[PDB]
Amino acid sequence: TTSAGESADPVTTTVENYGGETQIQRRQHTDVSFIMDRFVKVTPQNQINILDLMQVPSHTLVGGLLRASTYYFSDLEIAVKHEGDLTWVPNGAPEKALDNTTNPTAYHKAPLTRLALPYTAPHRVLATVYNGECRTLPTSFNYGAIKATRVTELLYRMKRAETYCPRPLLAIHPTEARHKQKIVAP
C-alpha cells in the first residue's frame, strides 16, 4: 500500500495484497508476564546484597527485556545459596536491620532458600532509566536487601511483571553478512 510515511500511524500490509493468505499466530511466548517469569543468576556480594533488578546483566534474556521498558512493576522471588541464615529487610530499612532476626530470617536448609517477596518501594512503578543526574538511579529503586554469612548464588525471578514505554532491544551486530553460530544438531 502506499501511505503518507511522515505520519507514524502504523501500516501493516498482508500477503493477501498479492494473493496469499494470512495464517493464525499463537503469541504466548512473547507475552510479558510469561517471558519475564523465570530465574536469572546475578553475581552476588559476599554478605550484603541489595535486591536490585538492574543487577541482572543486560545481555541476558531478562536483562535485555527489562531494559526494553522504561517503567516496570513486579513482585519478586529469589533463590539463594548461603552459609548461615538469611535475613531480608524491606525497602527503606536501615542497613543495620539486616542483623536482626525478627526481620524475615530463613534458617539454613540445604541446598538453597527460595523466597516469595512483595514489591516494597514507595513509588507506584520503578524505572530502568531515570533522568535526574545527566548511570545512577534513585536509591529508593530496590526490593530491599538480604544478608547471610556468605552468599554464593543469587537468582531473581519477576512475578506478575508489567512494562510501560518500550525502549531499544539490540541484537549482536554481525561482522559478516549474517551472524552465524553452531546450533544444536545430532
Partner: protein, 210 residues
C-alpha cells in the same frame, strides 16, 4: 503545487496554523491519568494560565550533518513566563506537552528528520538511533511537510514531580537522511520548536525570598 492539510492548534490565547499538516501523534495515551492522588492530600490546583505556547530555536539543519546527528531538549526547559514562575513557587508539579516542531526550507530540498518525544533520556547510543521510532514520533520530509506535531501526557515513577531535579521528557530531532539543496532548495533549514505545557497542576507552595 502547495497543500490543503490544514490544522490550527490553540493553547490558551496562542494559536499556531500550518498548511502542510500530516496530523498529530499522540504518545502512550490519549488523556492524562489521575491528577489527584494521595501524595498531594487534595492540595493541588490547575493553573490554566500556564497552558500556552512558548518558543525555542533548536538547531540549523545543514548539508554537512549526517545520519544520527541529534539535537536533544530536556523538558521542562527555561521558561521566563508564567509556567517558568510556577516552578519557583510550588514544590511539586505535573503537566503534559503539546509539541510542534517546524523545519521550513521548501519542497525542492530533500533529506529527512525524525522528531521524537523520549521519556527519561539519560543520552542515547548510536545503534539505538535505529530504533528511535519506538518512541512517540513523526517525520519531517520536505517534499511532504514542514511541521511535526506530537502530544504526550505526564509520565514518571511519581504522580507529581520536582522539576528542579528530574526531567521526564526529552524532545529529540535526528537527521535520518542528509539535507540536499540541489539548485532550487533552501540552502539550510533552521529548526524551531513551539511547545505548550498541558494540564499543569501544582502543589506545595514555597515561601518567598522576603
Amino acid at each position: 503545487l502547495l497543500e490543503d492539510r490544514i490544522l490550527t492548534t490553540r493553547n490558551g490565547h496562542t494559536t499556531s496554523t500550518t498548511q502542510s499538516s500530516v496530523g498529530v501523534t499522540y504518545g502512550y495515551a490519549t488523556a492524562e491519568d489521575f491528577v489527584s492522588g494521595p501524595n498531594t492530600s487534595g492540595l493541588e490546583t490547575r493553573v490554566v494560565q500556564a497552558e500556552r505556547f512558548f518558543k525555542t530555536h533548536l538547531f540549523d539543519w545543514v548539508t554537512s550533518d549526517s545520519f544520527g546527528r541529534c539535537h536533544l531538549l530536556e523538558l521542562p526547559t527555561d521558561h521566563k513566563g508564567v509556567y517558568g514562575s510556577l516552578t519557583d513557587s510550588y514544590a511539586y508539579m505535573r503537566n503534559g506537552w503539546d509539541v510542534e516542531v517546524t523545519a521550513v526550507g521548501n519542497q525542492f530540498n530533500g533529506g529527512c528528520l525524525l522528531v521524537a518525544m523520549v521519556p527519561e533520556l539519560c543520552s542515547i547510543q548510536k545503534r539505538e538511533l535505529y530504533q528511535l521510532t519506538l518512541f512517540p514520533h513523526q517525520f519531517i520530509n520536505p517534499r511532504t511537510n514542514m511541521t511535526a506535531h506530537i502530544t504526550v501526557p505526564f509520565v514518571g515513577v511519581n504522580r507529581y514531580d520536582q522539576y528542579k531535579v528530574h526531567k521526564p521528557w526529552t524532545l529529540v530531532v535526528m537527521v535520518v537522511a542528509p539535507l540536499t539543496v540541489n539548485t532550487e532548495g533552501a540552502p539550510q533549514i533552521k529548526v524551531y520548536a513551539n511547545i505548550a505545557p498541558t494540564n499543569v497542576h501544582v502543589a506545595g507552595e514555597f515561601p518567598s525570598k522576603e
